[PDB]
Amino acid sequence: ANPCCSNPCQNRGECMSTGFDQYKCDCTRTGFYGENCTTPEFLTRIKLLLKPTPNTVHYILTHFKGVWNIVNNIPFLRSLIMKYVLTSRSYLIDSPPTYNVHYGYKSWEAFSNLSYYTRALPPVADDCPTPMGVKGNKELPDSKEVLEKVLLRREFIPDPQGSNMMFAFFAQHFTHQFFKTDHKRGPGFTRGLGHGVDLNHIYGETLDRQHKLRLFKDGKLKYQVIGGEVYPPTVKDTQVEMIYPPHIPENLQFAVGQEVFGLVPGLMMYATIWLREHNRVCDILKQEHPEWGDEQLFQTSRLILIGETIKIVIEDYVQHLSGYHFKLKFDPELLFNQQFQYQNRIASEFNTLYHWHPLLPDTFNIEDQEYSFKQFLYNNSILLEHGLTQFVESFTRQIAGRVAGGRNVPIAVQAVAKASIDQSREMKYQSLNEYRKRFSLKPYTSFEELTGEKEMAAELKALYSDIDVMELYPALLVEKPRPDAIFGETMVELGAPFSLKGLMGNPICSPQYWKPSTFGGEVGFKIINTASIQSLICNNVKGCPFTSFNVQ
Amino acid sequence: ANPCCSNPCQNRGECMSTGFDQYKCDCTRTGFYGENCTTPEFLTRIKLLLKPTPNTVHYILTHFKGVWNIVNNIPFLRSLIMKYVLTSRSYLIDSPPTYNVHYGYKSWEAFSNLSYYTRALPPVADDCPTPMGVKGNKELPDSKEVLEKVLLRREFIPDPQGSNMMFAFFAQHFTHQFFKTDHKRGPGFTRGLGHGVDLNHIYGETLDRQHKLRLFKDGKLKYQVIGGEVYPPTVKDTQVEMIYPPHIPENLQFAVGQEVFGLVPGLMMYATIWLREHNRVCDILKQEHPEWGDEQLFQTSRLILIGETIKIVIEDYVQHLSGYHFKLKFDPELLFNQQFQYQNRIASEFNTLYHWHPLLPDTFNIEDQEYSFKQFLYNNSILLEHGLTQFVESFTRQIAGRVAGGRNVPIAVQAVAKASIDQSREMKYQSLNEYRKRFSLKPYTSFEELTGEKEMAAELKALYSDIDVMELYPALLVEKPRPDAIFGETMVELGAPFSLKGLMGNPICSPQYWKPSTFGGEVGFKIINTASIQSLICNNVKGCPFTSFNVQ
Ligand code: HEM
Ligand code: HEM
Ligand SMILES: *[C@@H]1O[C@H](CO)[C@@H](O[C@@H]2O[C@H](CO)[C@@H](O)[C@H](O)[C@H]2NC(C)=O)[C@H](O)[C@H]1NC(C)=O
Ligand SMILES: *[C@@H]1O[C@H](CO)[C@@H](O[C@@H]2O[C@H](CO)[C@@H](O)[C@H](O)[C@H]2NC(C)=O)[C@H](O)[C@H]1NC(C)=O
Ligand SMILES: Cc1cc(NC(=O)C2=C(O)c3ccccc3S(=O)(=O)N2C)no1
Ligand SMILES: Cc1cc(NC(=O)C2=C(O)c3ccccc3S(=O)(=O)N2C)no1
Ligand SMILES: CCCCCCCCO[C@@H]1O[C@H](CO)[C@@H](O)[C@H](O)[C@H]1O
Ligand SMILES: CCCCCCCCO[C@@H]1O[C@H](CO)[C@@H](O)[C@H](O)[C@H]1O
Ligand SMILES: *[C@@H]1O[C@H](CO)[C@@H](O)[C@H](O)[C@H]1NC(C)=O
Ligand SMILES: *[C@@H]1O[C@H](CO)[C@@H](O)[C@H](O)[C@H]1NC(C)=O
Ligand SMILES: *[C@@H]1O[C@H](CO)[C@@H](O)[C@H](O)[C@H]1NC(C)=O
Ligand SMILES: *[C@@H]1O[C@H](CO)[C@@H](O)[C@H](O)[C@H]1NC(C)=O
């Protein structure tokens, strides 16, 4: 019914109805004009002729290693390239944000209501004849069939980039501070009102929760000591609400900032490490500032840990997953003379693409044990049994699964994968190809081009008929990986700009925050600027075990 | 005891304690170095030894009328200057915001908690030996004595700039969407969580209040007709909470977005006008878009009225109060190639400086009647009796009071003036001279220099002893005005950057919003770009009476 149902406006032109059966494309600042914003301005043809494709740039970043070594060791040159990386990657995201699950046009409600995830692409209107707009059949193919045919794991496929369980659980722990769906309201709603890296998964989303978690001495968070080792306090001792099945002993219900972190020992491992890190930073600050009170010690340490998180995420975590030989750098100063908005709104599509469940193994191997999913979930006794040191050593050694490439979702979480499909449809996501165009990628012209093989493509052809009807979420998991890579093109090109905004958009990266006094002086500042996944583990885990995001 | 109590760091350097009796200044990016950030770097020496003073700039903007006349009539030149004006006025506000009433250092709590007003200068620490830090006596002078000696009106002092009651009530109506102190929590807290121009004073702060005010047909707001004229609906009809004394009959309990707007018929006049404007724009959009539903008509109209409001605030309202011969321009495009943060957090000091109660007359003169304060307050029957047309005609003719220059607060609101003093102290405001330095102004060296006269200066000298201990709020009302102006230097130099951020920081001014389709096409867009206080009144008040912000 809506004349904009067919998504006729190209190159980010905006579609507006002008009657029951007519539309107008607003081509303002797109660089194109004409009825559908497809005629390039002269400068546009110049830009287009020059810009390399994402696969070309990926090739360059993953080759000429000898050259990247030269670059990485020349400070001013590394800075220069990172500066370019930053600006190149930061023009695709609407900031201030625009659409959401209930608004396919800009509105004050969509802007102002922080309970929604934002949307990179507006939803397919409710009165459109087909789920994707006007293409395809009345209903999309059975989600169970999609799941069973091309997503479910047959044999475990290891990640060729060598990602390990330290990587998988770091991804889970880190992202679950800003992916926190409010199931009461619906899949298009979030409980993470900070919309980014605020460390609410350590400190609590609300002030009441934070205060229940705090010791109110020396800036510290409450903790218990068990067999000489520091662990989170209990629900019983703190009244911090946590999600635990009823059969869990009171003494095993650890209470942390994020209420779902009792779900798996690997989340609780990271919760425990960051808890120790907070109190460690508290000791350092108290040493540097014997005149400070508890409140300032707490707040300053939180700012420092936010800093360390952003640092580690960029220079270790994103560094590893990218596969780049270029050494990414966390340096807010690089944006100070550039246009950039210090703010972020978490996109629904970012949440959706980040469902990296293929990472998980069939069993979790710690020391000489192999835990099934059933044994592993909600089982903090496993953490106490083995200890943090053994957990790190074991997770560092265990390979994670490949995410793109298809057929690698562990069956234990098949309901989760089905729900990602079903809820994408519920939220009226536009198709894979629309999202590809939205991120300046070439539309796939066949299912074989998407997968790079023939068997899964054939299954999908039979299911969807038209590549233009293929959905974003399953596509991300069946996409042809880059050579020996964990992800395909669509995953990287969508994930990167969302991730950048969540990290650099933090206020601590703004010029008035990014200075020593914000972090209690040069000592606190140095903690941020020297942070690494290895140092986080070395400072807080007995014996300073070697760790890394890849298997050795 | 805090070693930062004396405010040792200059030129926006940040003070941090480094022990019980030592501090350190963080001079990062100040352009100065040395223990207190007072040694100018070389390039700072250049900038300084040729930056014109605010009074010089104000001289130039308010003279050479013939030159400005040429400038105003050459579009590219007017734009060029406005572009300069915009950037020259946007480097003084911390954005993302920093301090608040409870935090004299940056913290995640101060950044994230939207219920606080933010602070342009951090509060004086609790354990400082004196209210202002280290200077002055153990107690500030009796606020009643300060009020009675230099603030309270003897004889009515008319504004020489000719500001009228349309101006005064516009100031009150417009600002009360973002100055909404949460008295439950304290003077440092706000109920205006949008922190700017969101028009919650028409539409309501919350969705459920908004939905009570809406007709749910054609995008319109509920209204009632009395004697052939459109007025806001009642509390009985809508169920929205309003503040009214218990003796107001049900038929006079008007319901509007801001709960206090029944306080005064002047506010209800503007509430009525803006309600009519919303419904007018709904009519226009429905004509443009027969295919649109109620929700989109409502949301689009709200966006349009937001643009109208910003347009009128800049080009009529601020235009009048500034006294500039240069014609200010609302043009979001002028910021598109500039560094600028599209966000805003309302500053407590902005709230404080905007207590412009000396504007108020001794009596409110409508048609042939002169109403007293007791007669005027909470008396909407006056509005019904005379009507909007007579309100506009009368308020356009009636002169408002001068704000700077002292002794012009009407006795009827003396408790409000005393509270501004008392709450400033509660919120631990730094001194007038610290605020002047914060905004690049020369500190006053005596009370006579502050007032430009001798009698009020002498009383203040007796009360305060030291000019460096003089408080911000009463200083603003006793300050020497610019020549035949309504305000003095401090008022304009603090007010201007805060005001700019609230208006241009609005998301509708960002590039992704500032396009015709956001407002339902060129028709909606034209309504914003041609808006004016005269056309607002012309379109919505019977007879289209002439109006202006100047008695003229
Ligand atoms: C043993 C490990 C894991 C289990 C048992 C698990 C299970 C689940 C379940 C049941 C949900 C749905 C939760 C809900 O709807 O409230 C979910 C959501 C999610 N998972 Fe996993 N998952 C695991 C690991 C991971 C990993 C390694 C990642 C890496 C990125 C990940 C990413 C996500 C994301 C981003 C969501 C959506 C969060 C939200 O919107 O609230 N998960 N997972
Ligand atoms: C008949 C006219 C007016 C009356 C009866 C009035 C009265 C009041 C009162 C009772 C308060 C609350 C004080 C407190 O809680 O301590 C207040 C606050 C305020 N007034 Fe007025 N006023 C009037 C006109 C104006 C005008 C013309 C302006 C011009 C801008 C203005 C600006 C303000 C501001 C900015 C506040 C602080 C509001 C807040 O933070 O919520 N008022 N006024
Ligand atoms: C914003 O900060 C205020 C000030 O601390 C918070 O209000 C306090 O909240 C606690 C409950 O968490 C109450 O016991 C206090 O009475 C409140 N104090 C005041 C002065 O109101 C408020 O909760 C914070 N808001 C958010 C969203 O965290
Ligand atoms: C943000 O939007 C959601 C969705 O509209 C709002 O949730 C609705 O609020 C009304 C109250 O006016 C309830 O009657 C509905 O049940 C809510 N719907 C859902 C899905 O929860 C929410 O109130 C909005 N938040 C704000 C701050 O306005
Ligand atoms: C997949 C995937 C990729 C990804 N992120 C990135 O590719 C990606 C980042 O996350 C990012 C973070 C900080 C500064 C710059 C970059 S980047 O240039 O946009 N790039 C390396 N997150 O998930
Ligand atoms: C007093 C007072 C002044 C004032 N504002 C101004 O002086 C002032 C504005 O408010 C402003 C509004 C939009 C764009 C640019 C300007 S300005 O250059 O900062 N200037 C004229 N608000 O209260
Ligand atoms: C060659 C001069 C170019 C124009 C400069 C005009 C400056 C006059 O400006 C003066 O500034 C003083 C500063 O305190 C104020 O006291 C005066 O009121 C003001 O007139
Ligand atoms: C409403 C004003 C209150 C007047 C009575 C108490 C004020 C006492 O204050 C005095 O008032 C005189 C008034 O012009 C001034 O000459 C004095 O300088 C001032 O001290
Ligand atoms: C614009 O797009 C529509 C698709 O809805 C197409 O039918 C029309 O011919 C296009 N016009 C062009 C490309 O000039
Ligand atoms: C939890 O882990 C422990 C090992 O610490 C194991 O003995 C136990 O069986 C597990 N619980 C469940 C329900 O599998
Ligand atoms: C720095 O400031 C303090 C002011 O309290 C003063 O004691 C010291 O002499 C100053 N040093 C300078 C201005 O070089
Ligand atoms: C209310 O306004 C009317 C004029 O409409 C006036 O005559 C009356 O005195 C006012 N009421 C009070 C209590 O002042």
mmCIF file of all heavy atoms in Angstrom, chain B residues 175-202:
data_model
loop_
_atom_site.group_PDB
_atom_site.id
_atom_site.type_symbol
_atom_site.label_atom_id
_atom_site.label_comp_id
_atom_site.label_asym_id
_atom_site.label_seq_id
_atom_site.Cartn_x
_atom_site.Cartn_y
_atom_site.Cartn_z
ATOM 1 N N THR B 175 11.578 29.510 27.928
ATOM 2 C CA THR B 175 12.603 28.954 28.817
ATOM 3 C C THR B 175 12.052 27.899 29.759
ATOM 4 O O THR B 175 12.781 27.001 30.184
ATOM 5 C CB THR B 175 13.324 30.034 29.669
ATOM 6 O OG1 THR B 175 12.366 30.721 30.482
ATOM 7 C CG2 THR B 175 14.030 31.030 28.768
ATOM 8 N N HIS B 176 10.772 28.004 30.107
ATOM 9 C CA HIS B 176 10.198 27.042 31.058
ATOM 10 C C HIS B 176 9.970 25.614 30.496
ATOM 11 O O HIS B 176 9.448 24.711 31.178
ATOM 12 C CB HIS B 176 8.945 27.608 31.700
ATOM 13 C CG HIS B 176 9.237 28.630 32.740
ATOM 14 N ND1 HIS B 176 10.218 29.586 32.581
ATOM 15 C CD2 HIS B 176 8.694 28.843 33.961
ATOM 16 C CE1 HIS B 176 10.249 30.360 33.651
ATOM 17 N NE2 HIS B 176 9.340 29.929 34.506
ATOM 18 N N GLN B 177 10.396 25.390 29.259
ATOM 19 C CA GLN B 177 10.421 24.017 28.795
ATOM 20 C C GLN B 177 11.714 23.354 29.251
ATOM 21 O O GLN B 177 11.747 22.152 29.407
ATOM 22 C CB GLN B 177 10.247 23.902 27.282
ATOM 23 C CG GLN B 177 11.486 24.316 26.497
ATOM 24 C CD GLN B 177 11.161 24.477 25.035
ATOM 25 O OE1 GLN B 177 10.944 23.486 24.341
ATOM 26 N NE2 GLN B 177 11.069 25.725 24.569
ATOM 27 N N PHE B 178 12.775 24.116 29.489
ATOM 28 C CA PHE B 178 14.022 23.475 29.911
ATOM 29 C C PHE B 178 14.506 23.903 31.292
ATOM 30 O O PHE B 178 15.388 23.243 31.849
ATOM 31 C CB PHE B 178 15.145 23.581 28.857
ATOM 32 C CG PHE B 178 15.311 24.956 28.265
ATOM 33 C CD1 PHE B 178 15.871 25.988 29.006
ATOM 34 C CD2 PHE B 178 14.938 25.210 26.952
ATOM 35 C CE1 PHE B 178 16.036 27.280 28.451
ATOM 36 C CE2 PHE B 178 15.078 26.499 26.386
ATOM 37 C CZ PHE B 178 15.631 27.531 27.137
ATOM 38 N N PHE B 179 13.917 24.970 31.853
ATOM 39 C CA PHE B 179 14.139 25.315 33.262
ATOM 40 C C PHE B 179 12.936 24.797 34.008
ATOM 41 O O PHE B 179 11.888 25.435 34.030
ATOM 42 C CB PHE B 179 14.290 26.837 33.488
ATOM 43 C CG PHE B 179 15.483 27.444 32.778
ATOM 44 C CD1 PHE B 179 15.399 28.723 32.219
ATOM 45 C CD2 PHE B 179 16.667 26.710 32.622
ATOM 46 C CE1 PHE B 179 16.492 29.276 31.550
ATOM 47 C CE2 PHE B 179 17.761 27.238 31.945
ATOM 48 C CZ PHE B 179 17.670 28.527 31.391
ATOM 49 N N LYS B 180 13.073 23.602 34.566
ATOM 50 C CA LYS B 180 11.981 22.918 35.263
ATOM 51 C C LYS B 180 12.571 22.230 36.493
ATOM 52 O O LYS B 180 12.719 21.017 36.541
ATOM 53 C CB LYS B 180 11.303 21.877 34.347
ATOM 54 C CG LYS B 180 10.818 22.444 33.012
ATOM 55 C CD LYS B 180 9.705 21.532 32.409
ATOM 56 C CE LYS B 180 10.247 20.143 32.067
ATOM 57 N NZ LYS B 180 9.174 19.236 31.576
ATOM 58 N N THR B 181 12.912 23.024 37.493
ATOM 59 C CA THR B 181 13.618 22.507 38.648
ATOM 60 C C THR B 181 12.828 21.471 39.407
ATOM 61 O O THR B 181 11.664 21.674 39.687
ATOM 62 C CB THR B 181 14.072 23.650 39.548
ATOM 63 O OG1 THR B 181 14.968 24.458 38.784
ATOM 64 C CG2 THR B 181 14.820 23.125 40.778
ATOM 65 N N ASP B 182 13.462 20.337 39.703
ATOM 66 C CA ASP B 182 12.810 19.290 40.483
ATOM 67 C C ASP B 182 12.951 19.589 41.975
ATOM 68 O O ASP B 182 13.915 19.169 42.611
ATOM 69 C CB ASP B 182 13.419 17.926 40.164
ATOM 70 C CG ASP B 182 12.596 16.766 40.724
ATOM 71 O OD1 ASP B 182 11.740 16.960 41.622
ATOM 72 O OD2 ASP B 182 12.815 15.642 40.251
ATOM 73 N N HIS B 183 11.996 20.321 42.532
ATOM 74 C CA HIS B 183 12.097 20.777 43.914
ATOM 75 C C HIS B 183 12.083 19.645 44.944
ATOM 76 O O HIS B 183 12.522 19.843 46.078
ATOM 77 C CB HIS B 183 11.010 21.824 44.220
ATOM 78 C CG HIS B 183 11.106 23.050 43.363
ATOM 79 N ND1 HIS B 183 12.108 23.985 43.516
ATOM 80 C CD2 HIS B 183 10.356 23.472 42.316
ATOM 81 C CE1 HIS B 183 11.959 24.940 42.616
ATOM 82 N NE2 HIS B 183 10.908 24.650 41.870
ATOM 83 N N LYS B 184 11.575 18.473 44.561
ATOM 84 C CA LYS B 184 11.658 17.294 45.423
ATOM 85 C C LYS B 184 13.129 17.032 45.737
ATOM 86 O O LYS B 184 13.528 16.933 46.904
ATOM 87 C CB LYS B 184 11.116 16.049 44.716
ATOM 88 C CG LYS B 184 9.669 16.074 44.282
ATOM 89 C CD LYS B 184 9.430 14.934 43.288
ATOM 90 C CE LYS B 184 7.952 14.662 43.054
ATOM 91 N NZ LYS B 184 7.298 14.048 44.244
ATOM 92 N N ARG B 185 13.928 16.945 44.675
ATOM 93 C CA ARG B 185 15.325 16.564 44.774
ATOM 94 C C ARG B 185 16.237 17.699 45.214
ATOM 95 O O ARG B 185 17.190 17.460 45.957
ATOM 96 C CB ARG B 185 15.802 16.034 43.430
ATOM 97 C CG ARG B 185 15.052 14.801 42.948
ATOM 98 C CD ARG B 185 15.812 14.132 41.814
ATOM 99 N NE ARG B 185 15.026 13.104 41.145
ATOM 100 C CZ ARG B 185 15.065 11.821 41.469
ATOM 101 N NH1 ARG B 185 15.846 11.423 42.463
ATOM 102 N NH2 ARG B 185 14.320 10.942 40.809
ATOM 103 N N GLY B 186 15.948 18.922 44.762
ATOM 104 C CA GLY B 186 16.764 20.072 45.106
ATOM 105 C C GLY B 186 17.035 20.987 43.927
ATOM 106 O O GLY B 186 16.706 20.662 42.771
ATOM 107 N N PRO B 187 17.637 22.153 44.212
ATOM 108 C CA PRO B 187 17.780 23.185 43.186
ATOM 109 C C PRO B 187 18.713 22.799 42.051
ATOM 110 O O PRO B 187 18.634 23.402 40.969
ATOM 111 C CB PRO B 187 18.329 24.397 43.964
ATOM 112 C CG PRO B 187 18.847 23.867 45.262
ATOM 113 C CD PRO B 187 18.030 22.633 45.552
ATOM 114 N N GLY B 188 19.555 21.794 42.274
ATOM 115 C CA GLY B 188 20.455 21.347 41.231
ATOM 116 C C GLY B 188 19.852 20.309 40.292
ATOM 117 O O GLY B 188 20.553 19.770 39.431
ATOM 118 N N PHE B 189 18.559 20.021 40.431
ATOM 119 C CA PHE B 189 17.943 18.962 39.619
ATOM 120 C C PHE B 189 16.841 19.493 38.707
ATOM 121 O O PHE B 189 16.154 20.457 39.040
ATOM 122 C CB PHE B 189 17.390 17.837 40.506
ATOM 123 C CG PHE B 189 18.449 17.117 41.300
ATOM 124 C CD1 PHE B 189 18.891 17.618 42.521
ATOM 125 C CD2 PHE B 189 19.014 15.950 40.809
ATOM 126 C CE1 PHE B 189 19.876 16.961 43.243
ATOM 127 C CE2 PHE B 189 19.994 15.287 41.517
ATOM 128 C CZ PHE B 189 20.421 15.785 42.744
ATOM 129 N N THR B 190 16.672 18.839 37.565
ATOM 130 C CA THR B 190 15.684 19.253 36.592
ATOM 131 C C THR B 190 14.713 18.125 36.287
ATOM 132 O O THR B 190 15.049 16.942 36.419
ATOM 133 C CB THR B 190 16.350 19.724 35.289
ATOM 134 O OG1 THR B 190 15.339 20.096 34.348
ATOM 135 C CG2 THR B 190 17.214 18.610 34.668
ATOM 136 N N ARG B 191 13.510 18.500 35.862
ATOM 137 C CA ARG B 191 12.519 17.537 35.388
ATOM 138 C C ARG B 191 12.514 17.525 33.871
ATOM 139 O O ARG B 191 11.790 16.724 33.259
ATOM 140 C CB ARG B 191 11.114 17.910 35.872
ATOM 141 C CG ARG B 191 10.943 17.885 37.388
ATOM 142 C CD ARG B 191 9.557 18.371 37.779
ATOM 143 N NE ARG B 191 8.525 17.449 37.311
ATOM 144 C CZ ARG B 191 7.215 17.667 37.431
ATOM 145 N NH1 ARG B 191 6.777 18.779 38.008
ATOM 146 N NH2 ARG B 191 6.340 16.777 36.978
ATOM 147 N N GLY B 192 13.284 18.436 33.270
ATOM 148 C CA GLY B 192 13.340 18.562 31.818
ATOM 149 C C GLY B 192 14.445 17.686 31.217
ATOM 150 O O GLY B 192 15.562 18.137 30.919
ATOM 151 N N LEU B 193 14.130 16.415 31.043
ATOM 152 C CA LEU B 193 15.149 15.427 30.674
ATOM 153 C C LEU B 193 15.630 15.531 29.226
ATOM 154 O O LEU B 193 16.642 14.926 28.872
ATOM 155 C CB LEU B 193 14.682 13.989 31.006
ATOM 156 C CG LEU B 193 14.379 13.795 32.507
ATOM 157 C CD1 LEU B 193 14.229 12.309 32.860
ATOM 158 C CD2 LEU B 193 15.452 14.433 33.414
ATOM 159 N N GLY B 194 14.889 16.255 28.399
ATOM 160 C CA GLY B 194 15.315 16.545 27.042
ATOM 161 C C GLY B 194 16.409 17.601 26.990
ATOM 162 O O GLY B 194 17.051 17.752 25.952
ATOM 163 N N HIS B 195 16.582 18.356 28.081
ATOM 164 C CA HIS B 195 17.677 19.339 28.197
ATOM 165 C C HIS B 195 17.760 20.320 27.015
ATOM 166 O O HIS B 195 18.836 20.597 26.478
ATOM 167 C CB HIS B 195 19.020 18.626 28.415
ATOM 168 C CG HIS B 195 19.220 18.139 29.821
ATOM 169 N ND1 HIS B 195 19.732 18.908 30.827
ATOM 170 C CD2 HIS B 195 18.911 16.944 30.386
ATOM 171 C CE1 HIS B 195 19.761 18.223 31.948
ATOM 172 N NE2 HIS B 195 19.254 17.022 31.717
ATOM 173 N N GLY B 196 16.620 20.857 26.615
ATOM 174 C CA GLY B 196 16.600 21.793 25.513
ATOM 175 C C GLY B 196 15.233 22.022 24.913
ATOM 176 O O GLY B 196 14.207 21.936 25.597
ATOM 177 N N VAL B 197 15.230 22.312 23.617
ATOM 178 C CA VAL B 197 14.035 22.774 22.935
ATOM 179 C C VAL B 197 13.266 21.595 22.363
ATOM 180 O O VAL B 197 13.287 21.339 21.156
ATOM 181 C CB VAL B 197 14.397 23.801 21.849
ATOM 182 C CG1 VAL B 197 13.134 24.423 21.245
ATOM 183 C CG2 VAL B 197 15.301 24.915 22.462
ATOM 184 N N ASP B 198 12.578 20.864 23.229
ATOM 185 C CA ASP B 198 11.841 19.713 22.732
ATOM 186 C C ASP B 198 10.343 19.968 22.676
ATOM 187 O O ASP B 198 9.558 19.093 22.305
ATOM 188 C CB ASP B 198 12.151 18.479 23.579
ATOM 189 C CG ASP B 198 11.817 18.663 25.052
ATOM 190 O OD1 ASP B 198 11.189 19.679 25.455
ATOM 191 O OD2 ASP B 198 12.230 17.769 25.825
ATOM 192 N N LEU B 199 9.955 21.161 23.117
ATOM 193 C CA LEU B 199 8.545 21.563 23.186
ATOM 194 C C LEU B 199 7.704 20.699 24.115
ATOM 195 O O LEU B 199 6.492 20.564 23.903
ATOM 196 C CB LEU B 199 7.893 21.673 21.791
ATOM 197 C CG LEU B 199 7.960 23.062 21.104
ATOM 198 C CD1 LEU B 199 9.407 23.642 21.007
ATOM 199 C CD2 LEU B 199 7.356 22.989 19.706
ATOM 200 N N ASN B 200 8.325 20.159 25.165
ATOM 201 C CA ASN B 200 7.562 19.416 26.187
ATOM 202 C C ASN B 200 6.546 20.317 26.888
ATOM 203 O O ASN B 200 5.577 19.838 27.480
ATOM 204 C CB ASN B 200 8.465 18.769 27.244
ATOM 205 C CG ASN B 200 9.088 19.795 28.201
ATOM 206 O OD1 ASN B 200 8.459 20.207 29.178
ATOM 207 N ND2 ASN B 200 10.323 20.217 27.910
ATOM 208 N N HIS B 201 6.763 21.627 26.821
ATOM 209 C CA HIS B 201 5.827 22.573 27.453
ATOM 210 C C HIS B 201 4.494 22.713 26.681
ATOM 211 O O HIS B 201 3.537 23.339 27.147
ATOM 212 C CB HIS B 201 6.487 23.957 27.706
ATOM 213 C CG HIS B 201 6.935 24.680 26.464
ATOM 214 N ND1 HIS B 201 7.335 24.039 25.313
ATOM 215 C CD2 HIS B 201 7.056 26.014 26.206
ATOM 216 C CE1 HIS B 201 7.670 24.930 24.396
ATOM 217 N NE2 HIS B 201 7.523 26.141 24.915
ATOM 218 N N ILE B 202 4.453 22.123 25.493
ATOM 219 C CA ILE B 202 3.248 22.042 24.662
ATOM 220 C C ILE B 202 2.735 20.589 24.629
ATOM 221 O O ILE B 202 1.535 20.332 24.760
ATOM 222 C CB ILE B 202 3.559 22.490 23.211
ATOM 223 C CG1 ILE B 202 3.926 23.973 23.185
ATOM 224 C CG2 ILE B 202 2.373 22.180 22.239
ATOM 225 C CD1 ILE B 202 4.669 24.389 21.914
#
